[PDB]
């Protein structure tokens, strides 16, 4: 549903690659939030803990209070690599069906997002339910699917 | 705050038979996904047997025609029934709500142990 | 033996499925290169052949 | 037209996506532009394709 | 169901006149565009007049000058006056409503026959 | 402001369509950037072109 | 229509002070930009400072710790405390409200000027 699968290929295409230390943004206290940060037990870190890709944070909110619908809301993602270096930026968004999405969000309607940098845009909307087997994963059996 | 507590376990017999039960409370029982998970002594964690919101059930491999879940919505509760249990069953075994993401969480564990 | 000709790569920048295009025409110009270098080297051994036989 | 075919007289929206190409539409609503290379039969409605 | 019910055709010479009615019922009248229609012997269907929900008419150019469509909302009726009648125009004449998409529909038809 | 100005609060959309070629903006309220590159004098709002 | 209205300008040795008023109206103060500006003889108009509808303040360089831009929301006022005058600093000044787009408004203006 994206372009996603061609990142390696494009990453291998440069001679020095490497992944930031430093988060881009701080994901706790995001636009929308606050939120705490989802985990799963799809992706066992190191000593077996629930963890999630190092490239993003998967924002749940925090509060009930502010447990709602939301209108698309808009972050900057800045540089913070080294004069020279390329920035690669990876995200994307969680989708489950509809008792599950109003049980996680607060809201069961599809929902939208936008990206762009250097004049490249491109847009998504989700979908709720009725999705497709799970492959390539962790092998655990999940209600919801992410795009990346 | 959720709680999950698992009991049932026991020292048997290959060939032998349990029954797993998981008394859940602090969450809405009947929207979650429930998991048993194991742990057998020198490995990580694997899935078992997983029952969604409908009753729909999911095995791994090795426990199909052996172990069967199930759910009592009515009385927070979770059943593996375990048949024809093997030595290689050995294990802590681990009731689970939403494993997948966000706030999964994972009970206190009972331990079944076969051998002859 | 000791003729330098440079080779050819993928582009960096161009990736399959989205710039299709762009590695047709790629396709294209090393295709149209190997053609014009197998051609200039070709002379370079007839004309050492002459050389050869002249001598 | 809309209401009766749709229930609905407010733009619709459409997305589609195939190899990591995505396009996005949003329909108009009334005010088309003349007919053109078409069968030559008054409509009020227009496609996009 | 939609009904379509026309009548006014007969047999008349040319340089003559007739008038069509259609009687619709079944439908919202006032707010479908109405057509009329004609077939003439050995061809396919070809449109000659149109009326929108506003009152605005088009016409084939070959009748232009000659025909008029109308309408009466009040009374669920469509109109065409044919004046100036050719020997070409002969044809079964029909009615319809929303001929373009998505549920189109013709009425029965009337016969006019143009003929010295 | 967005209210006073236009009637309406919420993140505003746009689409642009030409020879093939389509583009997607939605439009941020507040939060803004600092000033850049402009006439020098502080606005509340910013355009996007 | 917006009303602006200023006054307390006047001719004042360098060194001296002034204060500049501004009295609104016709518009919702308390949620509109408010800007001093002025006007050198032969030069256009420039911003001298500005407040924003949380008591937020910005002021030109040149007026630094000498000019002080300063609202009363209650009475519909706009003050700017001018300290340390400047010969340099002689110009029309005038109120305005939300100058940049769409509807900029400026007042009627107040002289000041500064000489020895
Ligand atoms: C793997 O996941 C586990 C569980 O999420 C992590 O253990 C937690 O680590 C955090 C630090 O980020 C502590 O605040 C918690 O108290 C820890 N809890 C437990 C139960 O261990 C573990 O750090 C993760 N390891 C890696 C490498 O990501
Ligand atoms: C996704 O997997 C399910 C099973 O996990 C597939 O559903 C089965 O399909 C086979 C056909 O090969 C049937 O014989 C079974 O009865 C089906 N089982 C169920 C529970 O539906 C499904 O076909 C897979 N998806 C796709 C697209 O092939
Ligand atoms: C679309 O067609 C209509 C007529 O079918 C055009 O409207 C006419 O324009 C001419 C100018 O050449 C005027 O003299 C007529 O009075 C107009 N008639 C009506 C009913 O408006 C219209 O101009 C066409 N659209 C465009 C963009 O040219
Ligand atoms: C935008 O400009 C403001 C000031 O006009 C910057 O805010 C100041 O940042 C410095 C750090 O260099 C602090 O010492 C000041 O206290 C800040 N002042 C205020 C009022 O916040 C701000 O950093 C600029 N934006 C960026 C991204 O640098």
């Known amino acids: 549903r994206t372009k996603i699968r061609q990142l390696p290929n494009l990453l291998r295409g440069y001679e020095h690659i490497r992944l930031s230390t430093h988060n881009v943004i701080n994901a706790e206290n995001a636009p929308g939030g606050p939120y705490k940060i989802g985990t799963s037990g799809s992706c066992p870190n190191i000593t077996n803990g629930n963890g999630f890709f190092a490239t993003m944070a998967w924002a749940v909110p925090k509060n009930d209070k502010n447990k709602t619908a939301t209108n698309p809301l808009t972050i900057e993602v800045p540089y913070i690599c080294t004069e020279g270096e390329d920035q690669i930026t990876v995200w994307g968004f969680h989708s489950d069906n509809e008792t599950q999405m109003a049980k996680l969000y607060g809201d069961s309607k599809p929902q939208k997002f936008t990206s762009s940098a250097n004049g490249v845009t491109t847009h998504y909307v989700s979908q709720i339910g009725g999705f497709p087997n799970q492959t390539e994963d962790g092998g655990l059996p999940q209600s919801g699917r992410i795009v990346v | 705050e959720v709680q999950l507590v698992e009991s049932g376990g026991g020292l048997v017999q290959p060939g032998g038979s349990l029954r797993l039960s998981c008394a859940a409370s602090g969450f809405t029982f009947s929207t979650s996904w429930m998991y048993w998970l194991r742990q057998a002594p020198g490995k990580g964690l694997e899935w078992v047997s997983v029952?969604?919101?409908?009753?729909?059930?999911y095995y791994a491999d090795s426990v199909k025609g052996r172990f069967t879940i199930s759910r009592d919505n009515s009385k927070n509760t979770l059943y593996l029934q375990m048949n024809s249990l093997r030595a290689e069953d050995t294990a802590v075994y681990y009731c689970a709500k939403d494993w997948g993401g966000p706030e999964p969480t994972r009970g206190q564990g009972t331990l079944v142990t076969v051998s002859s | 033996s000791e003729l330098e000709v440079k080779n050819l790569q993928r582009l960096s920048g161009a990736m399959d499925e989205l710039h299709n295009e762009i590695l047709e025409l790629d396709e294209k110009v090393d295709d149209l290169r190997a053609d014009t270098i197998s051609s200039q080297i070709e002379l370079a051994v007839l004309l050492s052949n002459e050389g050869i036989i002249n001598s | 037209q809309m209401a009766k075919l749709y229930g609905d007289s407010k733009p619709q929206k459409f997305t589609s996506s195939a190899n990591g190409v995505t396009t996005h539409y949003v329909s108009q609503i009334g005010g088309f532009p003349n007919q053109t290379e078409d069968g030559g039969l008054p409509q009020s409605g227009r496609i996009v394709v | 169901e939609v009904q379509l019910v026309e009548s006014g055709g007969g047999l008349v010479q040319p340089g003559g006149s007739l008038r069509l009615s259609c009687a619709a019922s079944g439908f919202t009248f006032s707010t479908s565009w109405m057509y009329w229609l004609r077939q003439a012997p050995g061809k396919g269907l070809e449109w000659?007049?149109?009326?929108?929900?506003?009152?605005?008419?088009?016409?084939?150019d070959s009748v232009k000058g000659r025909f008029t469509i109308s309408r009466d909302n009040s009374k669920n009726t469509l109109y065409l006056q044919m004046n100036s009648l050719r020997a070409e125009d002969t044809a079964v004449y029909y009615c319809a409503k929303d001929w373009g998409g998505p549920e189109p529909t013709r009425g029965q038809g009337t016969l006019v026959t143009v003929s010295s | 402001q967005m209210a006073k100005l236009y009637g309406d609060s919420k993140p505003q959309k746009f689409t642009s369509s030409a020879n093939g070629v389509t583009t997607h903006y939605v439009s941020q309220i507040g939060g803004f950037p600092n000033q850049t590159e402009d006439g020098g004098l502080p606005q509340s709002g910013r355009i996007v072109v | 229509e917006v009303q602006l209205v200023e006054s307390g300008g006047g001719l004042v040795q360098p060194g001296g002070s002034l204060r500049l008023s501004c009295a609104a109206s016709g518009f919702t103060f308390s949620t509109s930009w408010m800007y001093w500006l002025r006007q050198a003889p032969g030069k256009g108009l420039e911003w001298?400072?500005?407040?924003?509808?949380?008591?937020?303040?910005?002021?030109?360089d040149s007026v630094k710790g000498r000019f002080t831009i300063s609202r009363d929301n209650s009475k519909n006022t706009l003050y700017l405390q001018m300290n340390s005058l400047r010969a340099e600093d002689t110009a029309v000044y005038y109120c305005a409200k939300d100058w940049g787009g769409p509807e900029p408004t400026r007042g009627q203006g107040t002289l000041v000027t500064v000489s020895s």
């Open positions: 029952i969604n919101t409908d009753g729909g059930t």
